[PDB]
UniProtKB/Swiss-Prot annotation:
One of its GO terms (biological process) is DNA damage response. Keywords: Acetylation, Centromere, Chromosome, Isopeptide bond, Nucleus, Phosphoprotein, Repeat, Ubl conjugation. The chain holds residues 1 to 80 of 191 of the full protein. It comes from Mus musculus (Mouse). Its main location: nucleus. There is a cross-link at K35 (Glycyl lysine isopeptide (Lys-Gly) (interchain with G-Cter in SUMO2)). Homodimer. Interacts with histone H3 methylated at 'Lys-9'. Interacts (via Chromo 2; shadow subtype domain) with the MIS12 complex subunit NSL1; the interaction is direct, involves dimeric CBX5, and occurs during interphase. Interacts with POGZ; POGZ and PXVXL motif-containing proteins such as INCENP and TRIM28 compete for interaction with CBX5. Interacts with LRIF1 (via PxVxL motif). Interacts with INCENP. Interacts with TRIM24. Interacts (via the chromoshadow domain) with ATRX; the interaction is direct. Interacts (via the chromoshadow domain) with CHAF1A; the interaction is direct. This is Chromobox protein homolog 5. The gene is Cbx5. Residues 23-81 form the Chromo domain. Signal peptide: none annotated.
């Protein structure tokens, strides 16, 4: 048992990493209208609640979102039959 020159050979190769950032809407939190213009509260991936941002409906590239949201708001707001 003597250590003269230990020769070890191994290959793993692990090159999988990249730093990138993208903007993706999460869901419709609130909605407001001003000067005959509709707007919605968008939330980009990473932006905290306090970092919420408002955008025009014409920009809202997600109609389905609004449709669903209306479903929740309907229940929230008191008024099913009586307008």
């Amino acid at each position: 048992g003597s250590h003269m020159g230990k020769k070890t050979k191994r290959t793993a190769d692990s090159s999988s990493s990249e730093d990138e950032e993208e903007y993706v809407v999460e869901k419709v939190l609130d909605r407001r209208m001003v000067k005959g213009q509709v707007e919605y509260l968008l939330k980009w991936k990473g932006f905290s609640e306090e970092h919420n941002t408002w955008e025009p409906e014409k920009n809202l590239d997600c109609p389905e979102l609004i449709s669903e949201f209306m479903k929740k708001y309907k229940k929230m707001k008191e008024g099913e039959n009586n307008k």
